[PDB]
Amino acid sequence: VCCGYPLCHPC
């Protein structure tokens, strides 16, 4: 998904 939610990827 993003940077900051359950599914989210490495930032």
PDB file of N, CA and C in Angstrom:
ATOM      1  N   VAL A   1       0.853  -1.224   0.000  1.00  0.00           N
ATOM      2  CA  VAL A   1       0.000   0.000   0.000  1.00  0.00           C
ATOM      3  C   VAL A   1       0.899   1.290   0.000  1.00  0.00           C
ATOM      4  N   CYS A   2       1.444   1.681   1.162  1.00  0.00           N
ATOM      5  CA  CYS A   2       1.944   3.063   1.420  1.00  0.00           C
ATOM      6  C   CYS A   2       3.292   3.145   2.233  1.00  0.00           C
ATOM      7  N   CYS A   3       3.497   4.209   3.038  1.00  0.00           N
ATOM      8  CA  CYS A   3       4.294   4.134   4.293  1.00  0.00           C
ATOM      9  C   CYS A   3       3.454   4.559   5.552  1.00  0.00           C
ATOM     10  N   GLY A   4       2.685   3.640   6.160  1.00  0.00           N
ATOM     11  CA  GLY A   4       1.915   3.926   7.419  1.00  0.00           C
ATOM     12  C   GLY A   4       0.542   3.246   7.617  1.00  0.00           C
ATOM     13  N   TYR A   5       0.413   1.958   7.298  1.00  0.00           N
ATOM     14  CA  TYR A   5      -0.875   1.207   7.331  1.00  0.00           C
ATOM     15  C   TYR A   5      -0.570  -0.343   7.348  1.00  0.00           C
ATOM     16  N   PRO A   6      -1.426  -1.251   7.908  1.00  0.00           N
ATOM     17  CA  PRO A   6      -1.238  -2.739   7.850  1.00  0.00           C
ATOM     18  C   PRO A   6      -0.518  -3.430   6.639  1.00  0.00           C
ATOM     19  N   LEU A   7      -0.996  -3.208   5.411  1.00  0.00           N
ATOM     20  CA  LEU A   7      -0.393  -3.786   4.171  1.00  0.00           C
ATOM     21  C   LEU A   7       0.891  -3.062   3.606  1.00  0.00           C
ATOM     22  N   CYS A   8       1.308  -1.897   4.128  1.00  0.00           N
ATOM     23  CA  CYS A   8       2.240  -0.966   3.445  1.00  0.00           C
ATOM     24  C   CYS A   8       3.722  -1.437   3.248  1.00  0.00           C
ATOM     25  N   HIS A   9       4.325  -1.039   2.120  1.00  0.00           N
ATOM     26  CA  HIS A   9       5.693  -1.474   1.719  1.00  0.00           C
ATOM     27  C   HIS A   9       6.896  -0.812   2.510  1.00  0.00           C
ATOM     28  N   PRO A  10       8.145  -1.366   2.511  1.00  0.00           N
ATOM     29  CA  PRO A  10       9.355  -0.687   3.072  1.00  0.00           C
ATOM     30  C   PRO A  10       9.674   0.755   2.525  1.00  0.00           C
ATOM     31  N   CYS A  11       9.841   1.716   3.445  1.00  0.00           N
ATOM     32  CA  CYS A  11       9.901   3.168   3.133  1.00  0.00           C
ATOM     33  C   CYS A  11      11.312   3.674   2.723  1.00  0.00           C
TER      34      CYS A  11
END
